């Protein structure tokens, strides 16, 4: 019965993917961003210039105040609000209703996006990173405890404005090709994984693999970019610059700030390399790789001029808090968050990015010795 959930995600490019939800009795409809990089369910609950509607606790007979404040600071953006519970449903999801924690957002800074069409965020990660503390049950834990929905979900994020699917409770085999390859969830807080090897155009970066995971590596649908630790970011940008030295880009383009444009349909895709991330496998000394095309880490944007030039932002940025496999990385792939078996699955998506001579891939098995040493302690 997963077909009812296919194509239940929408979004604008760089602005996240949302699913339609209802809160309260009678049901109030809100668009909620799906974020595997946090664990708080939160909705606008007060007027905001960029909100087109919001949760009105005053109108829900099933609302219950928790008499406790809450605030969440992200890498970029933050909000504060009042905690409570209410009944929640997913119209294009399973046919159930859960009593869930809801943070009613009353103040926010650089969080809501101008003309974005979503009004809240659904944090799909584990209680350990919930605010104010791990005793606030995240939505998906409530869904699993209160219903018969199996303890996993999968995300198929499709590129450019954007759409996709969130399959709640299972795997839809018509959304991917090939085999699913699984990597262990190292720890149930973020969706933390271990990267064991990195290659650019087939060339190993040849760094101590601990650097790739310093201080952690996570899968985060709520972060747009691929974010790399400083040492890894410098090696990759050095390598991507060299592969595309045919052409010249402002140094502010490599910092994510400036666009680059080309006369429409002449984007020189061939001079940007592919990036291969190797992930810890399920059996001893075994890994698999995902290959990222340049169509994934060059994000399309709007021409500042009156031209029809294709314009792009560099969507690899530097991090001081570990590797983040963001939406840019997930777009090629069908991604299974198998919480019940503590693993994450990757396969080539049915809506996969298309190059003329290259293709995004999920390939295994690979042999990788000493994968355990790649985890950071
Ligand atoms: C704020 C956003 C939700 C709204 C914006 C969605 C699309 C906009 O896209 C721009 C973009 O890429 N943004 C805004 C990144 C830079 C970011 O900050 N994204 C967030 C993620 O939750 C961040 N997740 C991490 C994180 C960082 C810091 C704290 C925490 C808590 C405390 C919640 C555990 C979690 C794990 C990386 C969601």
Who's near 228: CB < 8 A, 6+ residues apart?
A: 236, 316, 317, 318, 319, 323
Active site residue 86: no
How many other C-beta atoms can be found within 10 angstroms of the C-beta atom of residue 81? 23
CB-ligand 1 contact for 152 (6 Å cutoff): no
SS3 for 371? helix
* Buried residues in 99-117 as b, exposed as e (16+ CB within 10 A): ebbbbbbeebeebbeeebe
Task: Kindly give the distance from the C-alpha atom of residue 250 to the centroid of ligand 1, in angstroms, as a whole number.
Answer: 27
SS3 for 227? strand
Q: Give the whole-angstrom CA distance, residue 224 versus residue 328.
A: 6
How many other C-beta atoms can be found within 10 angstroms of the C-beta atom of residue 188? 14
For residues 8 and 166, is the Cβ–Cβ distance under 8 A?
yes
172: buried, middle or exposed (CB in 10 Å: 19+, 13-18, 0-12)? middle
Out of 86, 220, 310, 338, the active site residue is 220
For residues 182 and 343, is the Cβ–Cβ distance under 8 A?
yes
Q: Single out the residue of 51, 157, 45 nearest to residue 113, CA to CA.
A: 51
For residues 299 and 291, is the Cβ–Cβ distance under 8 A?
no
Distances from the Cα of 294 to the Cαs of 73, 209, 312, 335, in angstroms? 31, 23, 11, 19
- The strand pairing partners of 100, in sequence order, are 86
SS3 for 159? coil
* Buried residues in 367-377 as b, exposed as e (16+ CB within 10 A): ebeebeebbbe
φ, ψ dihedrals at 3, nearest 5°? -60, -30
Structural domains of the chain, with CATH: 17-149 (2.40.70.10), 150-377 (2.40.70.10)
Half-sphere exposure of 233 (CA within 13 A, CB side): 21
* Buried residues in 298-313 as b, exposed as e (16+ CB within 10 A): bbbbeeeeeeebbbbb
Q: Give the whole-angstrom CA distance, residue 133 versus residue 145.
A: 19
For residues 344 and 193, is the Cβ–Cβ distance under 8 A?
yes
DSSP 97-155: -EEEEEEEEEEEES-S-TT----EEEE-S-GGG-SS-TTS--HHHHHHHHSS--S-EEE
DSSP 121-134: EEE-S-GGG-SS-T
Token pair of 256 as six digits: 């994510």
SS3 for 36? coil
Who's near 63: CB < 8 A, 6+ residues apart?
A: 24, 57, 84, 85, 86
From the CA of 324, give the closest atom in ligand 1.
37
DSSP 42-100: EEE-S--TT-S----GGG-TT-EEEEEEEEEE-SS-EEEEEEEEEEEE-TTS-S--EEE
For residues 117 and 161, is the Cβ–Cβ distance under 8 A?
no
284: buried, middle or exposed (CB in 10 Å: 19+, 13-18, 0-12)? exposed
The distance of Cα 283 from the centroid of its chain, to the nearest Å, equals: 26
CB-ligand 1 contact for 327 (6 Å cutoff): no
SS3 for 176? strand
Q: Single out the residue of 124, 105, 122, 87 nearest to residue 44, CA to CA.
A: 105
- Asked whether the CA dihedral 258, 323, 279, 165 is positive or negative, the reply is negative
Task: Kindly give the distance from the C-alpha atom of residue 360 to the centroid of ligand 1, in angstroms, as a whole number.
Answer: 25
The distance of Cα 42 from the centroid of its chain, to the nearest Å, equals: 17
Q: Give the whole-angstrom CA distance, residue 156 versus residue 7.
A: 9
Active site residue 220: yes
Q: Give the whole-angstrom CA distance, residue 186 versus residue 128.
A: 14
Q: Give the whole-angstrom CA distance, residue 178 versus residue 344.
A: 16
How many other C-beta atoms can be found within 10 angstroms of the C-beta atom of residue 51? 20
- The strand pairing partners of 177, in sequence order, are 348
At what resolution in Å was this solved?
Answer: 2.6
Mutate to test the pocket of ligand 1, among 32, 72, 75 (most ligand atoms within 8 A of CB): 75
The maximal CA–CA distance of the chain, rounded, in angstroms, is 64
Half-sphere exposure of 157 (CA within 13 A, CB side): 31
Token pair of 245 as six digits: 């030295």
Among protein residues, the one with the nearest Cα to ligand 1's atom 37 is: 37
How many other C-beta atoms can be found within 10 angstroms of the C-beta atom of residue 227? 25
Token pair of 173 as six digits: 């085999």
Mutate to test the pocket of ligand 1, among 223, 225, 256, 327 (most ligand atoms within 8 A of CB): 223
Let me know how long the chain is.
Answer: 377
Token pair of 358 as six digits: 């290259």
How many other C-beta atoms can be found within 10 angstroms of the C-beta atom of residue 97? 17
φ, ψ dihedrals at 194, nearest 5°? -120, 120
Give 294's DSSP letter: H
Q: Give the whole-angstrom CA distance, residue 39 versus residue 46.
A: 21
- The strand pairing partners of 228, in sequence order, are 318
């Amino acid at each position: 019965s997963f077909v009812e959930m296919v194509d239940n995600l929408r979004g604008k490019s760089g602005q996240g993917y949302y699913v339609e939800m209802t809160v309260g009795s009678p049901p109030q409809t809100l668009n909620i961003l799906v974020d595997t990089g946090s664990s708080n369910f939160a909705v606008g609950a007060a007027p905001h210039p960029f909100l087109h509607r919001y949760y009105q606790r005053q109108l829900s007979s099933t609302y219950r105040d928790l008499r406790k404040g809450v605030y969440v600071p992200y890498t970029q953006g933050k909000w504060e609000g009042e905690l409570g519970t209410d009944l929640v449903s997913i119209p294009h999801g399973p046919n159930v209703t859960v009593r869930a924690n809801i943070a009613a957002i009353t103040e926010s800074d650089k969080f809501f996006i101008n003309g974005s069409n979503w009004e809240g965020i659904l944090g799909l990660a584990y209680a350990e990173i919930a605010r104010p503390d791990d005793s606030l049950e995240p939505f998906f834990d409530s869904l699993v405890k209160q219903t018969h929905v199996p303890n996993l979900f999968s995300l198929q994020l499709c590129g450019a404005s954007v759409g996709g699917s969130m399959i709640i409770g299972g795997i839809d085999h018509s959304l991917y090709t090939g085999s699913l390859w699984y990597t262990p969830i190292r720890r149930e807080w973020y969706y933390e994984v271990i990267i064991v090897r990195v290659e650019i155009n087939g060339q190993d970066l040849k760094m101590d693999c601990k650097e790739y995971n310093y201080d952690k590596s996570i899968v985060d649908s709520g972060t747009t970019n691929l974010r790399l630790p400083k040492k890894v970011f410098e090696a990759a940008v050095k390598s991507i610059k060299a592969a595309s030295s045919t052409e010249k880009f402002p140094d502010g383009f490599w910092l994510g700030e400036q666009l680059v444009c080309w006369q429409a349909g002449t984007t020189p895709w061939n001079i940007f390399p592919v990036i291969s991330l190797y992930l810890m496998g399920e059996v001893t000394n075994q890994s698999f790789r995902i290959t990222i095309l340049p169509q994934q880490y060059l994000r399309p944007v709007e021409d500042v001029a009156t031209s029809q030039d294709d314009c792009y932002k560099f969507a690899i940025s530097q991090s001081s808090t570990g590797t983040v496999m963001g939406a840019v990385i997930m777009e090629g792939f069908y991604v299974v968050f198998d919480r019940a078996r503590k693993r994450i699955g990757f396969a080539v998506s049915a809506c996969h990015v298309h190059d003329e001579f290259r293709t995004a891939a999920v390939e295994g098995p690979f042999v990788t010795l000493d994968m355990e040493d790649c985890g950071y302690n």
